[PDB]
Design a protein around this ligand. Structure first.
Ligand SMILES: [Mg+2]
Ligand SMILES: [Mg+2]
Ligand SMILES: [Mg+2]
Ligand SMILES: [Mg+2]
Ligand SMILES: [Mg+2]
Ligand SMILES: [Mg+2]
Ligand SMILES: [Mg+2]
Ligand SMILES: [Mg+2]
Lengths: 249, 156, 138
RNA sequence: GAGCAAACCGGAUUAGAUACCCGGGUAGUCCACGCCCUAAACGAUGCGCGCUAGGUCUCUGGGUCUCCUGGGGGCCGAAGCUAAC
């Protein structure tokens, strides 16, 4: 049953039958206290820390600060970009690079090739040598973009970090704290609530939680201070958040 | 503000590695940079040429400094610190005592801007870990123990 | 069966703090209880309070630390960075008054056990007496 | 005293083989009582006791029993330790 949330998209489900001899284990469902992914233990402990954290995201915001989020799991990545562009800041989906922060003065160079290439495919210099290098410059521009598509907003090392799972993207969190950078992350029982600077004890995994915690973390920024504007947002045309703007091919 | 101190090279070495054909030296410099006002920092970078080796260590130096709590001209109090096998130990001394210590600990203490100490040594008199040796010492000197024992503790 | 009742406590506090526990329990007894009275008046530990566990008396020592730190390894500095036993059993170390220790150049105490209650380098000297040198804390 | 096997008897390989290989063979290995007491008799890590994250596999008793509590064996690992391993 899809409570107006599922939407009938002619989803067959012919190959989706439970004929997968799934009728094999009785204890198949070892079930615990994790049936939908919404845990809040001790409350007087977590809610205390939340206010804490979210009070800073607000501060770093107003102080003009910057917050690059760090995403690495498939269980996020894209969920990192939406909350990325919606909130004008740098993000890292694909993969971290040793030094992303403890080497700026060098990884930032890559960012430069990137921009450099991005210039050339805009001037008449297009096509002046063998297709080979033409592609030699396309591979790069392409790759570079794959791994640097979000680091282009880091003219200088950031005031904070928002890594999802400070245990899977630990290098990130190492590099960070080695440079006195408050590290903000999700974290759970299977994490280092000692390393995480400003914790938000959500579910490390679980798409939903992510989008839930990461969004307000994005909205809180945006709503930093305020203003009038009371005609509210429109529904169906929420494309500026990114969605799937203009395709190529 | 200003980020310039006085540099002192502690001890340099050629290191030699080996390959088909022959050997290949890598140089090691051990430098200490200081203010003589409370800040000092060790550093040892390697290189195929001593200078860079020094310069590098000159950069590693300035990056690892430690504001030393000097009272008058000495260390506020006593400390002995274990390292590899080295056991530097410094003892605060009256004025007019002099530095009084090894090539290494002296190179370090004398930049932290000390003037009167008495040093305890007892193992691996190795220019390197005695170097480091003298520093965690300087990192463990106390500022505000007076505060930590009596102050509240909110948000830890 | 413990061999040195005190030393046990001291240590139980020592490791306890190295892992940053909030408080540790230790077998009760006047002495230990009087020995912790000092660590408490002196700030090394928020405090102790007689407690029961399984039916046997124990003492809950609420350890005290410092603030979290910046950079790698953010664990809080220690309040009791060092706490050794001096006068062990089969090693009784009694010192005169002029033999009382100075300890961590006044940054630390040294609990004595003079025929006049359990005092610290300070007091004991102030009162003018010496006795078994139970420990040295800093 | 079946098999095996120092010494030893022959066979072969070798530049030479009192050796590796091959065919026999004694003490011995076996049991009884007595003697010897050594060992890489090694976890190369004395005994006892208290304290300090976990996870994983496994033997054995209790258990409101595929979870927790006791004893023993392995693995990986917190802090810590170590010259390093
Ligand atoms: Mg040692
Ligand atoms: Mg000395
Ligand atoms: Mg025969
Ligand atoms: Mg040996
Ligand atoms: Mg039972
Ligand atoms: Mg066991
Ligand atoms: Mg291990
Ligand atoms: Mg470790």
């Amino acid at each position: 049953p899809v409570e107006i949330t599922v939407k009938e998209l002619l989803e067959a489900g012919v190959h989706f039958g439970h004929e997968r001899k799934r009728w094999n284990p009785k204890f198949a469902r070892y079930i615990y206290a994790e049936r939908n992914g919404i845990h809040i233990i001790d409350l007087q402990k977590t809610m205390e820390e939340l206010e804490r954290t979210f009070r800073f995201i607000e501060d770093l915001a107003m102080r003009g600060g910057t917050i690059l989020f760090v995403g690495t799991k498939k269980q996020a990545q894209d969920i990192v970009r939406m909350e990325a562009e919606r909130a004008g800041m740098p993000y890292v989906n694909q993969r971290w690079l040793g030094g992303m922060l403890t080497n700026f003065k060098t990884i930032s160079q890559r960012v430069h090739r990137l921009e450099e290439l991005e210039a050339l495919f805009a001037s008449p210099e297009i096509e002046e040598r063998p297709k080979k290098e033409q592609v030699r410059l396309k591979h790069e521009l392409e790759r570079l973009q794959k791994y640097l598509s979000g680091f282009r907003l880091l003219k200088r090392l950031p005031d904070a970090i928002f890594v999802v799972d400070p245990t899977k993207e630990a290098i990130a969190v190492r590099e960070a704290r080695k440079l006195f950078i408050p590290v903000i992350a999700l974290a759970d029982t299977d994490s280092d609530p000692d390393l995480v600077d400003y914790i938000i004890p959500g579910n490390d995994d679980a798409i939903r939680s992510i989008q839930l915690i990461l969004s307000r973390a994005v909205d809180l920024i945006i709503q930093a201070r305020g203003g009038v504007v009371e005609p509210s947002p429109s529904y169906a045309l929420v494309q500026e958040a990114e969605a799937t703007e203009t395709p190529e091919g | 503000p200003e980020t310039d101190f006085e540099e002192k090279m502690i001890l340099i070495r050629r290191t030699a590695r080996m390959q088909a054909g022959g050997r290949r030296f890598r140089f090691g410099a051990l430098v200490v940079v200081g203010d003589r006002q409370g800040r000092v920092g060790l550093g040892f970078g390697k290189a195929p040429e001593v200078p860079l080796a020094v310069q590098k260590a000159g950069y590693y130096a300035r990056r690892n400094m430690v504001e030393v709590p000097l009272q008058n001209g000495t260390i506020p109090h006593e400390i002995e610190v274990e390292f590899g096998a080295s056991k530097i130990v410094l003892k605060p001394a009256a004025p007019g005592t002099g530095v009084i210590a090894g090539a290494v600990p002296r190179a370090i203490l004398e930049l932290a801007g000390v003037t009167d100490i008495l040093t305890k040594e007892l193992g691996s008199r190795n220019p390197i870990n005695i170097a480091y040796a003298t520093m965690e010492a300087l990192r463990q000197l106390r500022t505000k123990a007076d505060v930590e024992r009596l102050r509240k503790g909110e948000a830890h | 069966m413990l061999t040195d009742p005190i030393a046990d406590m001291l240590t139980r506090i020592r490791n306890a703090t190295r892992v940053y526990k909030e408080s540790t329990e230790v077998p009760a007894s006047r002495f230990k209880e009087e020995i912790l009275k000092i660590l408490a008046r002196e700030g090394f530990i928020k405090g102790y309070e007689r407690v029961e566990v399984d039916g046997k008396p124990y003492l809950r020592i609420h350890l005290k630390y410092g603030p979290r730190r910046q950079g790698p390894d953010p664990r809080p500095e220690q309040v009791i960075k060092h706490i050794r036993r001096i006068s062990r059993p089969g090693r009784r170390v009694y010192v005169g008054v002029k033999e009382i220790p100075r300890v961590r150049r006044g940054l630390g105490i040294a609990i004595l056990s003079t025929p006049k209650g359990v005092l610290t380098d300070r007091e004991a000297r102030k009162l003018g007496v010496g006795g078994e040198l139970i420990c040295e804390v800093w």
